[PDB]
Structure 1
Amino acid sequence: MELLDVIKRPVITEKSMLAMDEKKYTFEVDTRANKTLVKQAVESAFDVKVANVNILNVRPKFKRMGKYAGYTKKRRKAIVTLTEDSKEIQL
């Protein structure tokens, strides 16, 4: 897959916003991307230097509307920690 397709979007939440204060950035990533790919994708997309990437899988969540019930899509969340002496991401 292309590097520009690995990173889907940022994650903006109370937890991710807090983590930005520590210079780590949460993204939704392609479910098939390993944390090394994410590191490479982040660096090429933002010119930053990445110190560490932590990565989790998010299970699909049960939801219902009216008479219909199903599941939200599975997601893959990558927390990218930038090095010191490095540019930050500005989303």
Structure 2
Amino acid sequence: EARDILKRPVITEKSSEAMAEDKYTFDVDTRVNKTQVKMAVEEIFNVKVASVNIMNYKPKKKRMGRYQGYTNKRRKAIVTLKEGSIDLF
């Protein structure tokens, strides 16, 4: 279940500053809670989690040509480790 909870890492300027501060940003399944996120990270990466922050992103308006629709809604989790680190390369 844990590898379903964690979808992908998020790579941005703000996420990179977070990684400099030992915070790792993941896109997670939109149904899971932050406790599940913490358990999944601990299990997958064999690290210790200090805290997990979470937020939702609404669908964003997007178009190509005459077709206007929306992107997928997102759930973003920021995981603060107390022990260890995660190698994304």
Query: Same fold by TM-score, threshold 0.5 exceeded?
Result: yes
Equivalent position SS for 1:60: coil
* Counterparts of 2:52 and 2:12, CA distance in 1: 18
RMSD: 0.5
The total of aligned residue pairs comes to 88
Indicate the residue corresponding to 2:58 in structure 1: 59
* Counterparts of 2:66 and 2:5, CA distance in 1: 35
Greater percentage in strand: 2
Q: Which among 70, 80, 89 is matched to residue 86 of structure 2?
A: 89
TM superposition score normalised by structure 2: 0.97
Counting aligned pairs with the same residue, the percent is 68
* Counterparts of 2:34 and 2:84, CA distance in 1: 20
Consecutive unaligned residues of structure 1, counting only runs of 5 or more, are: none
Q: Which runs of 4+ in 1 moved over 2 A?
A: none
TM superposition score normalised by structure 1: 0.95
Indicate the residue corresponding to 1:37 in structure 2: 36
* Counterparts of 1:3 and 1:20, CA distance in 2: 21
Consecutive unaligned residues of structure 2, counting only runs of 5 or more, are: none
